[PDB]
Structure 1
Amino acid sequence: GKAKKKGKSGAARNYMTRTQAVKKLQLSLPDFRKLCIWKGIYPREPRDRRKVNKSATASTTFYYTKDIQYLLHEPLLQKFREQKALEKKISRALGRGDVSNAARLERNANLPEKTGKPRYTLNHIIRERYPTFQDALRDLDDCLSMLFLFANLPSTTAVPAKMIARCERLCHEFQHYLIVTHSLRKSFLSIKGIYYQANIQGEDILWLVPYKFNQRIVGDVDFRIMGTFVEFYMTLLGFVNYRLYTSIGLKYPP
């Protein structure tokens, strides 16, 4: 039939660069990175990156085109746009001097610094990422290490103090479940921290907890993306705690 043209099929259709993905979703870079963390969109590597983009370098990030197409349907995008428009309305009220209207509109923002909870709700994301409770139990190692670490950190704009208090509360609830079911198995005093190993429904769960000292936040880490991980993991640990308490027939939350 008609002769095909070069660069219209194959890897050039299979991959997108991060710039193309961000323009395709019409997002800002922080929102895009946050959404990729929350939905599990991972960087990919083509065989020949020039076939995808002629200006690509070794530091160019690639993603699957189908993964970006899937991100097009996520309901959090409208939540992002609603929060941006609400912030514009609050700015209008403050600039006109309507302090009561500004307070009333700010109550709809659901800011973490007053709620202790993430700014956006990730409940629908949890079931998509973990089809089974066994999958959630297998990701509990990373979840518990991150949350037990962040329970001992100072307040920041990325993770406010009330969110840190909620992290501590969730870790304490999980510890109480382990106590009343006698699920804790091993512990280890290393030079880095205290390792704990428990067994929940046949799954070994190993996590690392810092010694209680002043923890050092260095510029070598991306602390805001670590905060996005914290939001996702506290949303996961709340549901894990509810399921475990309901399974052993206790009222949740304690």
Structure 2
Amino acid sequence: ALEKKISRALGRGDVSNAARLERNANLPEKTGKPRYTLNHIIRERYPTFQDALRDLDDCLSMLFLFANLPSTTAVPAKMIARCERLCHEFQHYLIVTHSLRKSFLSIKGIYYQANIQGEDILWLVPYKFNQRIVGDVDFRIMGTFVEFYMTLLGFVNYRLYTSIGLKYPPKFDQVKDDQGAELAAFSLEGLNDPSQLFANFTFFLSRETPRQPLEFILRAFGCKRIGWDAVLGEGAFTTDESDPRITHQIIDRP
């Protein structure tokens, strides 16, 4: 009914009333959030945080894929940005808690397995390329799935951060976001075997290495002193490759 009223006003020429009815309609195209509140649906589908953690598998698979994917009408640019933000926040929780356990590289991408509250959680992240969209691939179905799992992961991150004690949502700065901080754009403040492997080391990443996966792994298992080339983005501990206080350096050039 609201959409019919918006079209009715637009066909009359009342642009101000059309805009007011649109902000009442709360389109995802502008909001960046799902069109409908699905809180009660998530609550009834998963009456337990354990069940939420058990479907968090497909939740993360969806969200990482659509955080990497280009923008369409079914899933807008702001919604993709929110997907990326939620994935990065979940990655920060994993880094802080050292919940990440095992990893794998395949012709399919990269597999991550973590353990949150006794539940094994797997997901596949594609390699940073231009993923092909060929054939009769319908993004509206995947858009509905994306909205559901965005709400689900948002509530999951809230509960995780509240349980650990850190405040949710983490502060996020558009300046470093634009300058390309990716995971380095979030500062985590509080509220008022795993972490030893690379702890007392210092790592540098060359321009030919996967920055997001390598950084996720190293932050999850300890390395607190990581740098990379300026092209890779902000947040590097040291940008100068000449700096002699670097222990290990990653190369994939012939």
TM-score, length basis structure 2: 0.66
| Bigger Cα Rg | 1
Partner deviation per Cα, 1:5-27 (whole Å, 9 max, x = no partner):
xxxxxxxxxxxxxxxxxxxxxxx
Amino acid at match of 1:221: V
Change (3 A) 1:119 1:184: same
CA contact (8 A) 2:75 2:139 kept: no
Deviation at 1:93, TM superposition (A): 1.2
**Is the aligned partner of 1:160 residue 2:40?**
no
> Aligned partners of 2:75, 2:11: CA distance in 1, in Å?
28
Distance 2:103 2:136 in 1: 30
Code of the aligned partner of 2:26? N
Structure 2's unaligned 5+ residue stretches are: 171-254
RMSD: 0.9
**Are 1:226 and 2:139 matched, yes or no?**
no
> Taking every aligned residue pair, what percent have the same amino acid on both sides?
100
Distance 1:220 1:87, change over 3 A: closer
1:236 aligns with 2:152: yes
Q: How far apart are residue 249 of structure 1 and its match?
A: 0.7
Unaligned 5+ runs, structure 1:
1-84
Aligned mate of 2:133, from 195, 202, 217:
217
User: How far does the alpha carbon of each residue in 1:191-211 deviate from its partner, in whole angstroms, 9 at most, with x for none?
Assistant: 110000111011111110000
Matched, 1:151 2:67: yes
Structure 1 residue 220 displacement after superposition? 4.0
> What TM-score does the superposition give when structure 1 sets the normalisation length?
0.66
Q: Say whether 1:131 aligns with 2:47.
A: yes
**Inter-partner Cα distance in structure 1 for 2:145 and 2:54:** 16
Is 1:175 the equivalent of 2:91? yes
CA–CA distance in structure 2, aligned partners of residues 217 and 121 of structure 1? 29
1:1-254 superposed matches below 5 A: 85-254=1-170
- Give, in angstroms, the shift of residue 157 of structure 1: 0.8
Moved beyond 2 Å, runs of 4+:
218-223
Question: Once the two structures are superposed, what CA deviation does each residue of 1:21-46 show, in whole Å capped at 9, x if it has no partner?
Answer: xxxxxxxxxxxxxxxxxxxxxxxxxx
Distance 1:247 1:128 in 2: 22
Give 3-state SS (helix, strand or coil) of 2:88's partner: helix
3-state SS of 2:103 partner:
strand
Determine the C-alpha separation between the residues in 2 that align with 1:215 and 1:180. 31
Aligned amino acid, residue 160 of structure 1? P
Higher helix share goes to which structure? 1
